[PDB]
């Protein structure tokens, strides 16, 4: 009667109820999240704002993605991080 755990591993996916919680002073805290969520969205918005305003010579892309065997998104990331210098980027990728 050795089950081998087959029957047990079915208790994991079994149906269950979503437990709830006593309502106590939550809108106080729930407003604090939108403060940290917004300053997350703000800080993340300005990071890509600096990255977008960078020169992107295309022939540099096709070279990095082929010499480093990385993808276009990764190759675009390295180039913008290095302000559009292929060497200064192709070197860091080697590291």
């Amino acid at each position: 009667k050795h089950d081998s755990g087959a029957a047990d591993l079915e208790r994991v996916t079994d149906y269950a109820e979503e437990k709830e919680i006593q309502s106590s002073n939550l809108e106080t805290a729930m407003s604090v999240i939108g403060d940290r969520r917004s300053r997350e969205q703000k800080a993340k918005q300005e990071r890509e704002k600096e990255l977008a305003k960078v020169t992107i010579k295309k022939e540099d892309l096709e070279l990095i993605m082929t010499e480093m065997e990385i993808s276009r998104a990764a190759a675009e990331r390295s180039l913008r991080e290095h302000m559009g210098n292929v060497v200064e980027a192709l070197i860091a990728l080697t590291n």
């Binding site: 009667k1 050795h2 081998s4 755990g5 047990d8 591993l9 994991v12």
Partner: protein
């Protein structure tokens, strides 16, 4: 040998020890089911080099009809490491963890009747008493003794 609680990082080496020593083998998702449901329960005996040499895969059996109790899903020690009491030291650490966390009352296991030496260790060293005979329990068609160990003494020994 170092004795310590088993973390998820250990389970793949536990399965390696299992498939080396026991014919009762399990899937990894089952090893996860133990370490992620009753993490305090399973323990390992490890080398200086992190090589698991003995293990205990423990579990809290879910019976609402009676008192809470534990179950050893698997226990094994390499033959290269006998006469070290790893079986005893491991069963003790797991048993206590059954009390601290889930207020466990006893603990159960099944064993081949042809394995008297292991049975004798449970019977004399660890006070495991036979509760029933479940025949042809293993795939080999061999009858297994359904042992039990009263944890009331150990729990009172700690209430102090």
């Amino acid at each position: 040998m170092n004795i310590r609680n088993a973390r998820p990082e250990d389970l793949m080496n536990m399965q390696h020890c299992n498939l080396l020593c026991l014919p009762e083998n399990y899937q990894m998702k089952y090893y996860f089911y133990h370490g992620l449901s009753w993490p305090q329960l399973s323990y390992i005996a490890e080398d200086e080099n992190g090589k698991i040499v003995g293990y205990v895969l423990a579990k809290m059996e879910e019976d609402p009809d009676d008192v809470p109790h534990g179950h050893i899903t698997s226990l094994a020690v390499k033959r290269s490491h006998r006469r070290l009491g790893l079986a005893q030291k491991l069963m003790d650490q797991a048993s206590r963890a059954m009390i601290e966390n889930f207020n466990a009352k006893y603990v159960s296991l099944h064993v081949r009747k042809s394995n008297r030496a292991a049975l004798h260790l449970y019977s004399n060293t660890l006070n495991f008493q036979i509760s029933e005979v479940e025949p042809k329990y293993y795939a080999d068609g061999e009858d297994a003794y359904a042992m039990k160990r009263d944890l009331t003494q150990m729990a009172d020994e700690l209430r102090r």
